[PDB]
Amino acid sequence: SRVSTRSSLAEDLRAIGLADGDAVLVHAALRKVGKIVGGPDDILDAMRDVIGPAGTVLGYADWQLEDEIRDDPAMREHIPAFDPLRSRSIRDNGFWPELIRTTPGALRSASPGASMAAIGGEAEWFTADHALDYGYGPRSPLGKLVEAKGKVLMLGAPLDTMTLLHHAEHLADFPNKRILRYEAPILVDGEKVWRWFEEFDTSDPPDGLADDYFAGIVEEFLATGRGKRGKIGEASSVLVPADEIVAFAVDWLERWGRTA
Amino acid sequence: RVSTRSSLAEDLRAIGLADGDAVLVHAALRKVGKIVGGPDDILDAMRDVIGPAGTVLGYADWQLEDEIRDDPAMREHIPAFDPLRSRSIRDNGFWPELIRTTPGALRSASPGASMAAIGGEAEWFTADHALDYGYGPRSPLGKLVEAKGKVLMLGAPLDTMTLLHHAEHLADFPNKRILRYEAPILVDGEKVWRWFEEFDTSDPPDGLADDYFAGIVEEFLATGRGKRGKIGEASSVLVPADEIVAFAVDWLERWGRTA
Ligand SMILES: CC(C)(COP(=O)(O)OP(=O)(O)OC[C@H]1O[C@@H](n2cnc3c(N)ncnc32)[C@H](O)[C@@H]1OP(=O)(O)O)[C@@H](O)C(=O)NCCC(=O)NCCS
Ligand SMILES: CC(C)(COP(=O)(O)OP(=O)(O)OC[C@H]1O[C@@H](n2cnc3c(N)ncnc32)[C@H](O)[C@@H]1OP(=O)(O)O)[C@@H](O)C(=O)NCCC(=O)NCCS
C-alpha cells in the first residue's frame, strides 16, 4: 500500500543492478508494481534516468494476427500486412511492449512474430536487420543483446516468459528440433505480399519438457548466485546478465538432449 | 459475424459519412464485435470513407485523478501534461489512445479538454486550444461546429457526447457552476503548476441528472435530423455537430427561463 514515484523507481532499479549505459530487455506484469503516481510511464522514465540516454530499453512486441489465415482462408485479402510502424503489439505480452512502442523516439524490429520494440541510444542498432527467418537467432535483437552484454529484467512477470531463452534453443545442439512453417502478410517495396516463414518453434516446448520449463532454468541459474533479485515498486523482480544465461541455458539444453 | 476494413467502410457509408467530413467519435469498441485486423480497421475504414482531407477526432483528456488534490506531498511527483507523451484517460476507452498513438496524429494543449485528431485538418483542430474554458469557441469542439462536422456514437452510451458541454458553455442560463483547479503543464518546456478555470463538465447544472445529455440526443433524434445504424455489431448514431449544439443550446436556455 506504498506508492511509487519516478524517483522511487530509479532507486529500486539501481538496487537491482541496472546501471549507466546498458541495454535491458524487460518483461513485466505491471499490476505487480502496485500504485504509481504517474502510471507505468514513470517506470520507463525511471529506467532511462538510471541507464542514461545511451542505454536502451527493450520490450517484446510480437504481433497481433491470431493465426487467422490458418483459422480461415478466404479471410486472406482482409488481413492487413505486418507494419512495424503501425502493427500493434500482441496483447498476451501485456501493456509493457506497447508502452514502449508508442513512446516517442521508439523503434520496432522487422521480423513480425519475433519483433521487438526498443527505445534509447542504440535502439536503431537493435531493431536493424532482424532476420525474417529464424528471427530468434544471431541476427535479432536477442542475439545483439548477448553481444552487447545486455541484461534481462523480469519485472514481476512469470519466469517462463524470458524470451531470450528461445535464442538459446536456436543455438543449442540437441536432437529433433521442431520446425515451424507458416505464411504471413508483410510489406515488400511498399506493398502487401504474402510470404513463407521458417523458424524453430517457440510456441511449444520441445520433446515433452513442460510449457514452463524456461522457469526452472532461470531458477537454477539464479541459484548459482550470478543473477540478482529485488523489488521494483511492489513487484518481485529478477535482473540477469543476457550472455551468461544464454550460455547457461544452451548447456542445460545440450545436456538434456544427450541425456535424452 | 466478422467485420473488415471493407465491411466497416460500407456501414460507415450507410450511416452517413462522406468525403471531407470532420467527425468526433465516441466509442464502446467491444460491441462492434469481432474485427479481423483489430479496431485499427475502424479508423482505417473511416479514413477511406472521409478521405485524406477529412478528419477523425477522439476525446483524450488525461490521467490526473486530482492526485494533486488526492494527496499533496505527491504534488511534486506528478509529471506535467505533455501533449505528446500524456496518455488519454482510460474512462474514455481505447478509441482516443488508438487515434493518439497512430502515426501522424496530433493532440491539443488544454489538458482536461484535450482532443486527439488525425487527418487533413488535424493541425487546425488541435491548434490554439484555450487553456481556460477549453470547451468554448477556441477549442476543437468549437471548430467542429465552424466546420459543420459530425459526432458518431460508435456503440457508446449517449450521454458521453462531449460536444454538448460546448453547448453548456454557449448557452445563457443562470448560475453556471464555475470550476477552479490547479494543474501541472509545460511552460518553457519546464513543469509549472497553473490555476485553471472552466464551466463545470464533471457535474450537471443544479437541476438536471448526470446523464441528461442522453435525453437531449434522443429528442434531437426524434426530430428526424439524425441517423441511426449499425457499425459492425454496434448500434450507432451520427449527428451534425452544428445542429445538435443549436438544438441543445435552446433546450438549455428554455429551461433556465423557468425562473
Ligand atoms: C500476462 C501479464 C502480461 C499480465 O499482466 P498484468 O499484470 O495483468 O498487467 P499488464 O502488464 O497487462 O498491465 C496491466 C496494468 O497496466 C496498466 N495500464 C494499462 N494500460 C494503461 C494505460 N493505458 N495507461 C496507464 N496504465 C495502463 C494498468 O495499471 C493495468 O492495470 P489495470 O488493469 O488494473 O488497469 C503478465 O502475467 C505477464 O505474463 N507478463 C509477461 C508477459 C511477457 O512478457 N510475455 C513475453 C512472451 S511469453
Ligand atoms: C467506457 C467504455 C469505453 C467501455 O466500453 P468497452 O466496450 O470496454 O470499449 P473499449 O473502447 O474500452 O474497448 C474494448 C476493446 O478493446 C479492443 N482493444 C483495446 N485495446 C486494444 C488493443 N491495444 N489492440 C486491439 N484491441 C484493443 C478489444 O476489443 C477490447 O476489449 P477486450 O477486453 O474484449 O479485448 C464505453 O462504455 C464508453 O462509455 N465509451 C465512450 C467513452 C466516451 O467517449 N466518453 C466521453 C466523455 S464522457
Author numbering:
A (entry chain B): 3 to 262
B (entry chain A): 4 to 262
What did the article's authors report about this structure?
AG resistance is primarily conferred by three classes of aminoglycoside-modifying enzymes (AMEs): phosphotransferases (APHs), nucleotidylyltransferases (ANTs), and acetyltransferases (AACs). AMEs permanently alter the AG substrate, preventing them from binding to their target, the A-site of the 16S rRNA in the bacterial ribosome. The fold typical of the Antibiotic_NAT family is evident in all structures, composed of 13 α-helices and 8 β-strands, and determined structures superpose with pairwise RMSD’s 0.8–1.0 Å between 197 to 266 matching Cα atoms.
Our data presented above demonstrated that the environmental metagenome-derived meta-AAC0038 enzyme can confer high and broad resistance to AGs including to the atypical AG apramycin when expressed in E. coli. The meta-AAC0038 adopts a dimeric structure with a buried surface of ~900 Å2 per subunit. This enzyme also forms a dimer in solution according to the size exclusion chromatography (not shown). The meta-AAC0038 and AAC(3)-IIIb structures superimpose with RMSD 0.54 Å across 219 Cα atoms, share all the minor subdomain structural elements, and show complete conservation of AG binding residues. However, the position corresponding to Glu223 in AAC(3)-IIIb is occupied by Asp213 in meta-AAC0038.
